[PDB]
Structure 1
Amino acid sequence: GTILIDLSPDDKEFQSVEEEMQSTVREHRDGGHAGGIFNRYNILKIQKVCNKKLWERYTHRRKEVSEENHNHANERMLFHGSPFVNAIIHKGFDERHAYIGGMFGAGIYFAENSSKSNQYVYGIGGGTGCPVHKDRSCYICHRQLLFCRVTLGKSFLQFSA
């Protein structure tokens, strides 16, 4: 049920998504070990993910949450990096996409910093890097991130290092 629609680089929607991607890069405490050493990206393509069933699944849940939280879904746009991006765009997020050993328990993790999600594209801790060169800092291989609509509802605040 999923189709992917390419956005033109001239499209304001392309430009606003690119700007979120580039503007939320930061340096990481690992010196680049997981995600590589970089200050910016070369954006090759931005596609809209269209799936009616998955969208209706999302909006159904969004309304449940909203109704439990004074009509406030607390919806954000956040990044997700994963080896499973292909399954996600076809079948949706589920328990198979959870970070079992995450610091806030087994759930599905999202970041405001695109460079944080970049650390997970090749797996936890960057895995062994790109499949072709086994380089976590590969400047050649094409990477993919998701920019996702996420319903937070009432969110439990955890202060953390």
Structure 2
Amino acid sequence: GTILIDLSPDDKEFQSVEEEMQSTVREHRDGGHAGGIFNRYNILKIQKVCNKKLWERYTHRRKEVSEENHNHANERMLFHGSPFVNAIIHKGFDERHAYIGGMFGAGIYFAENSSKSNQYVYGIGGGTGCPVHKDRSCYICHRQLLFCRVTLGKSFLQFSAM
């Protein structure tokens, strides 16, 4: 029951989301090994993901979390790159498919830096790169990221040496 609605580049909502993508690119200490060498994107399409049951599932949990955290859902908009983006948009996120080997425990990972999530669009560490050219720095092939509404609630602050 997922519907994808194309946003017009003339629309302030498109421009706003593009700006979040572009403005959160950073240099990565792998020199581009995982996600490629770039300072900016060419945004080709931005689609709103509409799914009533997944949304109600999210807002139901958001309410529980809010009530457990002095009425503060601590809701953020965060990036997520994954080979399984097409499954995520139809089936939702699924903690039975958490990232087992993530630094911060087996869970579902999100990034403020769009370019961090870009490192995972082709797999862990970029996998073997784009399917057509096997190039983690492919400038030709289209990539897809999700920009997700994420409820953090009371978030455990873990400082990492990254």
Q: Give the TM-score normalised by structure 2.
A: 0.98
Distance (whole Å) between structure 2 residues aligned to residue 58 and residue 147 of structure 1: 15
- The aligned counterpart of 1:21 is 21
- C-alpha offsets along residues 87-142 of structure 1, whole Å, 9 cap, x if unaligned? 00000000244111001110000000000000000010000000000000000000
Distance (whole Å) between structure 1 residues aligned to residue 95 and residue 73 of structure 2: 22
| 5+ long unaligned stretches in structure 1 | none
SS at structure 2 position matched to 1:64:
helix
| 94 and 64 in structure 1: CA distance in 2 versus 1, 3 angstrom threshold | same
Distance (whole Å) between structure 2 residues aligned to residue 39 and residue 122 of structure 1: 18
SS at structure 2 position matched to 1:65:
helix
- The aligned counterpart of 2:94 is 94
- C-alpha offsets along residues 36-59 of structure 1, whole Å, 9 cap, x if unaligned? 000000000000000000000000
Distance (whole Å) between structure 2 residues aligned to residue 97 and residue 152 of structure 1: 19
| 5+ long unaligned stretches in structure 2 | none
SS at structure 1 position matched to 2:66:
helix
Distance (whole Å) between structure 1 residues aligned to residue 95 and residue 52 of structure 2: 21
How many residue pairs match? The answer is 161
Bigger drift between 92-101 and 68-77 goes to 92-101
Distance (whole Å) between structure 2 residues aligned to residue 156 and residue 130 of structure 1: 35
State the identity as a percent. 100
Distance (whole Å) between structure 1 residues aligned to residue 17 and residue 46 of structure 2: 8
Distance (whole Å) between structure 2 residues aligned to residue 97 and residue 90 of structure 1: 15
Distance (whole Å) between structure 2 residues aligned to residue 100 and residue 145 of structure 1: 20
Note the aligned Cα RMSD (angstroms).
0.6
- C-alpha offsets along residues 5-61 of structure 1, whole Å, 9 cap, x if unaligned? 000000000000000000000000000000000000000000000000000000000
